[PDB]
RNA sequence: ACUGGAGGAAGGUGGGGAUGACGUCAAGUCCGCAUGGCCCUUAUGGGCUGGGCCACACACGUGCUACAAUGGCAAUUACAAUGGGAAGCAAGGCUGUAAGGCGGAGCGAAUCCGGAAAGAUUGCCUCAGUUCGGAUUGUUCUCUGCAACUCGGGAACAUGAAGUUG
RNA sequence: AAUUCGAUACAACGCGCAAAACCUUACCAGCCCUUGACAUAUGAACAACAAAACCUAUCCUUAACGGGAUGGUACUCACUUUC
């Protein structure tokens, strides 16, 4: 949801600490659990279905600030040439601007570059 | 009643921004002198429909074509005839 | 000097002049352009104008370069009354 | 003091603006807006009575009741 | 289990956790929308008497309700022309007085001779 | 008497004040209370009379109560308990965070 | 109407109107 | 360096969707705690402008451009560090100012031609 | 001493302490804030009785409304705070009427009409 | 009951709203909605553009502008309230004679946004059809929209109908 | 060719209108459609155990509606798909 309200933004677009790191959470809280490791193993063999349902009744995942990078590359690919000597300046402008509006649907914010490429190929 | 403005609204949502704020791109900037009609004339000729002044925004309780209020989507008629009947949240007589 | 004016206002003035989108087909035909600007490139054109019914024909001349394509066509034709 | 002069090179302003030094009208205001495709086009709201097969085949059942009553006197619409 | 049925319908089409209960309102139609809904049934098939409707009313309902004021309208019985009005009254029939829960809800049912419409203006004994 | 890092509360409904509501913050209700107005007409007919009017209005209500500085742990300890908390209205809980650099 | 008053009343911006001249004046002293 | 932060939580009012204000993120720092030199400090203060509480020292960096509170919480410190840097160059700029001022006067304030020609004796 | 007066949507706080010739609204020169034209004689009448003007000090402030509203507000604020001698000054004041508000607050606009009493023309 | 008098901030329904009987007038509207009955059922139905709803010998109605010098104008200065803002309100800087344009601190809004007009200070006018009066009335332009000849505003600058209290 | 229509003493005539470029719109002409844009049942039907349609996008003609393709996406033992 919101945050830990303890640490600053530690993101820096770092990584995904894979599962079974519950070794640490066993050091911390297995103190109220049992002497099995296949216990957690079956917890995972069910958390697969739990993840199915979580993504079903939760969302469809929202990616990253890497949308900026994929959109800048979409702009570089819309020109894909040395055609107009001004179409490229236009595309750079369009990327650096369109990536600002705080609501413009993040998928059309890529399909716009896609359509730029489309009519540039038709051009 | 609403049968045609529905199709026209949806056709706006069809020839959406995805093509109209696109074929309006090369209109305002300057330097692309190379046939600005490929984004002005022969493609921005969207069939004389799917516009956004063309959508009268009717009521939806009755279908009173004009005098609609934009918030409640009601007509002037049913708004005042209904907030009388209740089912309107907090809308009270301004005996100020 | 109507043609000269059109050339001084080609796009140095920002708006540009809007044509009604039929301006890519042949010239002399019934043109219910109806609010499409006069084209300076094509003066000396015998184009019949708009006809939902009763097209009023007009001879394109240098005189008319800034008005709309139907400048000949006059609607609300009532100028008479004798009691 | 030349420091009060040279202490200002501020042109980058990383905050994320888009800049035109001379000011040609730019395709910035056409894309500043929050988009006008879907929210307006979803204005006609929905009464559940498209569901509920117990008001369905009842409203139209009464319509065809009128059909029968007017067919009796044959004043109905022919083709 | 139509409660399950609707807690399916609407929670599916609205995407929210919902709770539907029904409570037996024992003293039948002390409300006004109930009375209107009621007499709009007897006025539907078959035909029935106005005076008998009001006789049933004064027979069963007067259990501390302060008063009942009831109006009708429509193409009355039975000259089928010149639709007119008629209304009955009782002990306490007030609306210019505030602090008086007096609930009102008209309704319109027909007879293929045009439509008839009733209105009901009950008044509740306040401070019991 | 004054607060710093905190969790603000500001409720907006049409009847906020008396509901058995969650009145356990340190500083109790302060209020703003706007007014809004849209008066149209008396009629229902579509052919008469722009001369008579009936006057509706809308008076939003907003209460303000602040949460004590529920710290790096208390913050979540109440955050979760109120991820769902129900009153019958819409309200606002604002965060005050201070992360050491 | 073309005076400042006519402009003000019509609701447009005339050459005895404008709400940036009010600044440009004193910012040019 | 202590910070000051704000991020709204107002409840979706039953309508199963997103509430517009949700994306606000308000940052508040102080370049009196971020112990600077006066010159880099004033260069950053110019780079912000009326983003900056100057009655009491506060930097504020709110970029609503982003949608979810996490991307907002990130963008705050991203821009924070960027500004820190593009201010941090100011002290070296001022150093070079000192250089030029001293140099273009060491030649015309007399008796320095001793070394001005001693470099050539060393040549 | 402290009083406050309000008239026609204008409110004025005032403070009288038994001093010498200071009278400062907005802590500004009051005769300039209220221009020479008038309102000064009006605001000095309240003490051109049982006072040679050489006994008191007034530090005041006022907001809201108009040129007559604010002057009335200040007047009646003084009239409030003339309770430095509480049970003996209302004697000299009520006689001439230096105590009560003008309760002629503006009459609103009703519907249908063009004002609160003006009405269109029927034929 | 009325007349005063008292206190009081409010004296006699303090002011305002709201609230509006029987009923009357075949009042209004089947063109909102609902509805009886009567007609069309390749049509009076559905959709598309054009064009019309904006005209004019003509009278009547409502509203606006003023014939002035209690004033017209230019520069100075003073004081509101409601409100409105995400197809949004936008400070500042820059640009345009300006309308406009560039871009944007903040703001989903007791926090961000919004030169009040009268009025006042000086000066010009000095009584005119005028520096009062502004319709008609040229060129450039521009806002939107896909689209401004018949068929939306907006600015620059020139022309200046009648109008002297009807 | 339309200058749409309802309002008609106080109790109509800046009235429905809280907003006529097209749209709004009934009114007028061209442009067509006719189980129609829309709804049920309707099986003669067609067959798909995945076709067809249908729809995100490309092209072309129509004053515009469309329409013609043309990919691709996409599927239902029910096809809205057909008269």
Curated annotation (Swiss-Prot), chain C:
This is Small ribosomal subunit protein uS19m. The chain holds residues 128 to 210 of 212 of the full protein. Belongs to the universal ribosomal protein uS19 family. Transmembrane segments: none annotated. The RNA-binding domain found in RPS19 may functionally replace the missing mitochondrial RPS13. Disulfide bonds: none annotated. Component of the mitochondrial ribosome small subunit. The gene is RPS19. It is found in: Mitochondrion.
Curated annotation (Swiss-Prot), chain E:
It comes from the Eukaryota. Coiled coil: none annotated. It is found in: Mitochondrion. Belongs to the universal ribosomal protein uS3 family. Component of the mitochondrial ribosome small subunit. This is Small ribosomal subunit protein uS3m. It comes from Arabidopsis thaliana (Mouse-ear cress).
UniProtKB/Swiss-Prot annotation, chain G:
It comes from Arabidopsis thaliana (Mouse-ear cress). The lineage of its organism: Eukaryota, Viridiplantae, Streptophyta, Embryophyta, Tracheophyta. The chain holds residues 53 to 81 of 98 of the full protein. Residues 1-19 are annotated as: Disordered. Coiled coil: none annotated. This is Small ribosomal subunit protein bTHXm. Belongs to the bacterial ribosomal protein bTHX family. It is found in: Mitochondrion. Residues 1-10 have a biased composition (Basic residues). Signal peptide: none annotated. Component of the mitochondrial ribosome small subunit.
UniProtKB/Swiss-Prot annotation, chain I:
Disruption phenotype: Aborted ovule development due to defects in fusion of polar nuclei and central cell maturation. It is found in: Mitochondrion. GO terms for cellular component: cytosol; mitochondrion; ribonucleoprotein complex; ribosome. Keywords: Mitochondrion, Ribonucleoprotein, Ribosomal protein, Transit peptide. The keyword Transit peptide applies. GO terms for biological process: embryo sac central cell differentiation; gametophyte development; pollen development; translation. Interacts (via C terminus) with PIA2. Component of the mitochondrial ribosome small subunit. Belongs to the universal ribosomal protein uS9 family. This is Small ribosomal subunit protein uS9m. It comes from Arabidopsis thaliana.
